Amino acid sequence: ATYHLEDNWVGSAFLSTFTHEAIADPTHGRVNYVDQATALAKNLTYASGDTLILRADHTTTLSPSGPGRNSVRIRSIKTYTTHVAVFDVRHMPQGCGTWPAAWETDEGDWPNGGSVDIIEGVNDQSPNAMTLHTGANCAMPASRTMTGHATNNNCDVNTDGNTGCGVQAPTANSYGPSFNANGGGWYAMERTNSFIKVWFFPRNAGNVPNDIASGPATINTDNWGTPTAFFPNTNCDIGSHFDANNIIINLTFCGDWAGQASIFNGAGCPGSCVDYVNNNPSAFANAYWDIASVRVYQ
Ligand SMILES: *[C@@H]1O[C@H](CO)[C@@H](O[C@@H]2O[C@H](CO)[C@@H](O[C@@H]3O[C@H](CO[C@H]4O[C@H](CO[C@H]5O[C@H](CO)[C@@H](O)[C@H](O)[C@@H]5O[C@H]5O[C@H](CO)[C@@H](O)[C@H](O)[C@@H]5O)[C@@H](O)[C@H](O[C@H]5O[C@H](CO)[C@@H](O)[C@H](O)[C@@H]5O)[C@@H]4O)[C@@H](O)[C@H](O)[C@@H]3O)[C@H](O)[C@H]2NC(C)=O)[C@H](O)[C@H]1NC(C)=O
Numbered sequence: 523a524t525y526h527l528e529d530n531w532v533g534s535a536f537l538s539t540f541t542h543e544a545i546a547d548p549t550h551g552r553v554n555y556v557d558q559a560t561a562l563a564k565n566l567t568y569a570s571g572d573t574l575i576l577r578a579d580h581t582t583t584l585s586p587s588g589p590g591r592n593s594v595r596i597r598s599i600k601t602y603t604t605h606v607a608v609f610d611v612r613h614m615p616q617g618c619g620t621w622p623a624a625w626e627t628d629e630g631d632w633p634n635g636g637s638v639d640i641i642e643g644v645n646d647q648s649p650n651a652m653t654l655h656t657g658a659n660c661a662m663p664a665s666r667t668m669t670g671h672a673t674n675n676n677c678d679v680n681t682d683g684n685t686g687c688g689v690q691a692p693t694a695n696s697y698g699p700s701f702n703a704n705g706g707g708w709y710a711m712e713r714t715n716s717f718i719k720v721w722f723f724p725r726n727a728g729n730v731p732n733d734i735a736s737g738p739a740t741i742n743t744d745n746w747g748t749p750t751a752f753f754p755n756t757n758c759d760i761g762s763h764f765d766a767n768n769i770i771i772n773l774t775f776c777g778d779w780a781g782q783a784s785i786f787n788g789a790g791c792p793g794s795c796v797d798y799v800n801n802n803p804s805a806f807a808n809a810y811w812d813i814a815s816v817r818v819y820q
Pocket residue numbers: 533565568570571572573575612
């Protein structure tokens with residue numbers, strides 16, 4: 523459970539170690555993902571000092587026939603197998619219609635190379651969800667040691683209605699406006715051949731491991747307490763469902779999850795998601811990631 527620093531990304535480092543994906547949104551959201559040059563010119567990405575900001579356009583009223591709201595999706599150039607990734611996050615996007623995520627995948631063969639969602643949610647609805655999506659023959663036991671609560675236990679995209687196998691974090695400040703009011707926190711994910719684990723520590727936690735908070739060169743996960751989400755190999759050969767994955771951090775709007783009427787209105791958001799996203803630019807002023815660092819250990 524001992525790992526050593528492999529990548530340390532802070533500030534402007536993200537501009538050379540990640541790319542921006544200017545792609546049609548695979549989740550069909552009301553978004554226009556821009557390239558790196560466009561994002562930097564429009565200040566949708568800001569990467570300087572000890573800060574990376576990734577944000578949505580919060581000024582344009584969209585043309586209903588035109589593209590969706592400008593935003594960004596960044597992807598690590600490097601890929602990882604057995605590793606730990608630690609995200610020191612000061613702020614995550616909020617607002618009705620938002621669907622932010624920090625996750626890992628191999629886009630080239632999805633879902634067969636796996637995806638693991640470390641931070642994800644929709645429409646300001648706490649708590650955070652940590653979820654795997656795989657091909658066939660991957661499920662999770664009903665009971666396993668973790669602080670969060672399992673919802674769906676079948677990870678196979680094809681037989682699970684694309685829900686994946688997910689765990690809900692136990693505290694509201696794991697996500698959304700609650701997380702932002704508290705100054706964010708740290709998310710760490712350990713992936714091995716035998717399991718995936720995710721830990722959340724709030725910014726003000728008296729028990730955050732120094733491993734996580736101070737980002738030294740060596741870490742030991744045996745000292746981190748019980749994970750928030752645990753995906754053991756009891757009913758899933760983890761290593762055979764995941765290959766080398768990139769880290770992705772993005773913000774979409776509406777789309778296949780957040781944009782469902784039942785879900786959007788369920789969250790207390792008014793009207794249709796697309797109409798809201800088109801017509802309320804100001805409401806996205808807080809639709810930004812503010813990331814202090816991302817570090818990977820191997
Ligand atoms: C494109 O978009 C970018 C991003 O939005 C725009 O940049 C912003 O521009 C505006 C306008 O110029 C800036 O607003 C000004 O900020 C002045 C103060 O800035 C300084 O402090 C900021 C807050 O620092 C504290 O909080 C953070 C955590 O959030 C800590 O990391 C930090 O250590 C500080 O902690 C102290 O305070 C807390 C409590 O609040 C205590 O608990 C701590 O112990 C400390 O006491 C900070 O964000 C700023 O950092 C920026 O600049 C430094 C270099 O100077 C760099 O290293 C950072 O990476 C970062 O870039 C800075 O230190 C304020 O006095 C003034 O009135 C005004 O509000 C704003 O700072 C900019 N934001 C950022 C992230 O840079 C940019 O303008 C835009 N381009 C356009 C539109 O043209």
